[PDB]
Design a protein around this motif. Structure first.
Motif, PDB file in Angstrom:
ATOM      1  N   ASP A  75       0.832  -1.178   0.043  1.00  0.00           N
ATOM      2  CA  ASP A  75       0.159  -0.287   0.205  1.00  0.00           C
ATOM      3  C   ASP A  75       1.035   1.129  -0.137  1.00  0.00           C
ATOM      4  N   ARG A 108      -7.859  -5.646  -9.408  1.00  0.00           N
ATOM      5  CA  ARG A 108      -6.902  -5.886  -9.469  1.00  0.00           C
ATOM      6  C   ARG A 108      -6.351  -7.500  -9.720  1.00  0.00           C
ATOM      7  N   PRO A 165     -10.459  -0.752  -2.345  1.00  0.00           N
ATOM      8  CA  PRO A 165      -9.717   0.229  -1.991  1.00  0.00           C
ATOM      9  C   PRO A 165      -9.280   1.077  -0.845  1.00  0.00           C
ATOM     10  N   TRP A 166     -10.266   1.235  -0.064  1.00  0.00           N
ATOM     11  CA  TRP A 166      -9.907   2.201   1.100  1.00  0.00           C
ATOM     12  C   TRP A 166      -9.502   1.020   1.936  1.00  0.00           C
ATOM     13  N   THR A 167      -9.602   0.130   1.634  1.00  0.00           N
ATOM     14  CA  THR A 167      -9.071  -1.182   2.782  1.00  0.00           C
ATOM     15  C   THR A 167      -7.185  -0.958   2.224  1.00  0.00           C
ATOM     16  N   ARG A 168      -7.396  -0.050   2.132  1.00  0.00           N
ATOM     17  CA  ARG A 168      -5.694  -0.275   0.833  1.00  0.00           C
ATOM     18  C   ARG A 168      -5.712   1.135   1.122  1.00  0.00           C
ATOM     19  N   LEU A 169      -5.731   1.759   2.302  1.00  0.00           N
ATOM     20  CA  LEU A 169      -4.781   2.729   3.029  1.00  0.00           C
ATOM     21  C   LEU A 169      -4.005   2.794   4.105  1.00  0.00           C
TER      22      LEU A 169
END
Ligand code: MN
Ligand code: MN
Ligand code: MN
Ligand code: MN
Ligand code: MN
Ligand code: MN
Lengths: 65, 294, 294, 68, 68, 294, 69
Positions: A9, B256, E29-33
């Motif tokens: 990330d 992804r 994607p917010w789980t990848r912040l």
């Protein structure tokens, strides 16, 4: 199905060089005559001068006259 | 005999000069790069089997000084291992400097530096979009025919740690077995249709269930469903491709399961995009490093 | 020249849409499909000699979205090889989409995709039952005449691995030797009687010993004895035909010596029939897969 | 007619899947024709097949002309 | 609480139809912040809300600012 | 200066297409939708006082083609009157199509179409959960700030025929008088706690006598006696809320004194839930229509 | 359900066909030569006309089609 890959990330960011990247686009000025001459050039080049394995001659991309 | 360290040195020397300055190799030196690198391409499989650590990069399109910066960013070979996904020439102003450095690094580090074929590494396309004109202006027509024989020998695809399938464009309806890629014999042209064409031209498109039309007028588009059944079929985890400009230099597709990489920032001075690389380490942990226009 | 992948791509792009959405090819695109496919049909024998593996399908009648489902079900080309038994146009609301996709796949995969002539692939019949009206409405009369030249060159029958004889309608009292089929010259019309007529029109009937009257007002009916004699004479094992709607999409005749195949489920919205296809594998093992209405 | 060894075999497994559900009812334009309509269409086919439709010389005897 | 009269009524007939059938799964994607990402976003939200986002004068005490 | 009918028409004509296809509105048209709808929201009370007949719907979360299917089922405005309970954006892939149609309908039918504020119509939440990324990708950051201005003006609750209290989340311990809702001035953000937070974030819980912890890390949970006490004090008959996915699309609580409505079937592709809406006719007879996955 | 409802209407298979008059129907299109100032002056005239002169039922004044200044 089990998945091995993982993504990090953390996105590394840096600055790209700042210069004028705009470039002329000569292809936009090709006339019909120009294209035909180039198709002639490529067909002759690919037929007699470009090396192509015997088993890949069916893939050679010849052009219409 | 070849003076490789001299070529690389001259090619890297312009680093720090004003972008646009020409590295002046001799005709014979350039033909030496093309002949020796061709030999190496032909000695390695057309479907590369690679291992992390590795940094994967996308389109450069003759933006030679953006390539030098890319190597500054990720490390000049052999500081890092590299896999490029094609489209080294055309559009940009310095396709010769770009491809010469890339070929030279392939000869210098043949086990740690790899180049895949793009749709612009074929005669008919780079005859029109600049590289031919660049060769004629600075040297002669024969040098362009010499580069062509080199491009006709590039590998087409690569699998990293049996889990990341890499190619320039994308998937093909005619791709049912990896053995179909391995049976492609080199040297070869890129055809106007079929497997090798699609591998260099196709595009993902979220609007297409299976296959669809490609705005380019070549090959097809493909959807998330195709990508999903492909990865499951061959027990892969990811498709890594380039071919399209994306805002951040990288962009994911189909949750992804596929990623587009594009490494030419500020492409053609027409987009305000970043250029990106993808690092894959021994853990198969992937990270993205980008060069953004300031 | 022909943008084949763009045409195919645009035709597939309606996958996932609600049935009825039209595909807008250009006039010259369609003409190009006709001309090139026609050329291929004439390059190949009028009595095709085919090999398993192969999937065999029957009537479509312009039910374009049922053809897409059929491909989704059995695998889009080139995932499977296909042999269609005719009657692509007429009655349905989208005969142009159907036949254009079929012709385009013939050109894309000429050694792995084959189309036989149905009794609706002739001028007099599809002049009345819809195709003409569809050509005149969305383009013009000339296009229908161009399609006619293409239809007049379609092959008429096929033998799979020397054991499965395939045609649209069935047997003819005039069929004593396969050379009689081979000797038919193209382009040709479908006559109102004779060998070519019966190959496209005749029907099996349990109530008929040898030959009988056909409720269609064309050609004849034929009985089980005819089939058994035919298979014994030519050392064939099966007749595979279409032409008639059957409840399960397939229906055997004369002790499994003949099978009728029909691929348009819920035909005309008047019947409650499934659509079927027959798969033949390299060992000549035949299986059926059907699309049943819910 | 029985000793003749047969090679083909049929699998006893028949796969079944759902067909798409939409309105397949279609208009039948040929049912609105008249007697005069058919005559004009027959004249059209004869003129088309005689002077326009390409037919191999050896197959001209198969061209299906119509009655006036 | 027991004897207050009630006006609302509920019908016993529930009508059922088919929802559209498509793949609704979507990337999150917010789980990848990263902590760095979330810090940078917190700063953005604080600047935007404090200098650009219009808020009634009597409701500025409701503005949801984020830790540094 | 706004062609509303052209905007609505474009948004609705993707009906029948494959779910996911975008509607291309101009930046100025979207800005027009926001600024005009914002004015209407501010011209109407923050606590809406509505009247039956009315159809009430729960979360959509950018599942645009499920919203179109909902309208097909319940009737496209103005065939039915509609109240939505919030959470129009985030998570789903087509938030912009979703909110633009809802705002267009609010401008077109301002007395027959109503939207309450959900917890995802606040900058801090939809900055993270997808909407912001959608605006940046298809347009720009400034457009997201324009939606924020519009969202900050939404009404917070609604009372239908003085008997059905409606809000996205649920009750608050700080809710003693409806006046506390009325006195809230707009534009306003959603605080981190207190009445305006609870009204958009709280959930009912069977295992709680009064107030309990909320597993969201925000606001509280409340029990059935809290619901019963609330209804008796304000002489209400039902609390209608959303905020939680429920299997049948609608689910009762506290002896049918509170109902949860959820209008996104197969929510996030993770649940096998139906989507529901509640119809309230002139007599206050309420009925449920559900869209169930097959 | 829609297919089972009884329909009274019927259509005849015979269509009568006559020849239309053969003259030149080309006509001028003055609206294609309106300048921006022209349209702005026309919008002002319609607004004055509709607000002060054009009779409108009391219950339909909300339908009167006014124009951007
Ligand atoms: Mn490129
Ligand atoms: Mn490319
Ligand atoms: Mn038929
Ligand atoms: Mn037939
Ligand atoms: Mn929600
Ligand atoms: Mn919520």
């Amino acid at each position: 199905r089990k998945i091995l890959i993982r993504f990090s990330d953390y996105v590394e960011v840096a600055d790209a060089q700042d210069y004028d990247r705009r470039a002329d686009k000569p292809w936009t000025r090709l006339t019909a005559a120009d294209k035909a001459a180039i198709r002639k050039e490529l067909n002759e080049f690919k037929s007699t001068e470009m090396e192509v394995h015997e088993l890949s001659r069916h893939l050679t991309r010849f052009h219409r006259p | 005999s070849l003076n490789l360290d001299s070529i690389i040195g001259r090619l890297l020397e312009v680093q720090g000069s004003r972008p646009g300055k020409n590295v002046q190799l001799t005709e014979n030196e350039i033909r030496g790069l093309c002949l020796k690198s061709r030999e190496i391409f032909l000695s390695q499989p057309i479907l590369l089997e690679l291992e992390a650590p590795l940094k994967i990069c996308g389109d450069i399109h003759g933006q030679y000084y953006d390539l030098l910066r890319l190597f500054e960013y990720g490390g000049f070979p052999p500081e890092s291992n590299y896999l490029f996904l094609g489209d080294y020439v055309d559009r940009g102003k310095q396709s010769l400097e770009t491809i010469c450095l890339l070929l030279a690094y392939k000869i210098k580090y043949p086990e740690n530096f790899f180049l895949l074929r793009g749709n612009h590494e074929c005669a008919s396309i780079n005859r029109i979009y600049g590289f031919y004109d660049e060769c004629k202006r600075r040297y002669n027509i024969k040098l362009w025919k010499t580069f062509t024989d080199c491009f006709n020998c590039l590998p087409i695809a690569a699998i990293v740690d049996e889990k990341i399938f890499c190619c320039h464009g994308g998937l093909s309806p005619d791709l049912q077995s990896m053995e179909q890629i391995r049976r492609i014999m080199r040297p070869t042209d890129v055809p106007d249709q079929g497997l090798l064409c699609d591998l260099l031209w196709s595009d993902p498109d979220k609007d297409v269930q299976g296959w669809g039309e490609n705005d380019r007028g070549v090959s097809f588009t493909f959807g998330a469903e195709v990508v999903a059944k492909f990865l499951h079929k061959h027990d892969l985890d990811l498709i890594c491709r380039a071919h399209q400009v994306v805002e951040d230099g990288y962009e994911f597709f189909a949750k992804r399961q596929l990623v587009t990489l594009f490494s030419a920032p500020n492409y053609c001075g027409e987009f305000d995009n970043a250029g990106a690389m993808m690092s894959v380490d021994e853990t198969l942990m992937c990270s993205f490093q980008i060069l953004k226009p300031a």
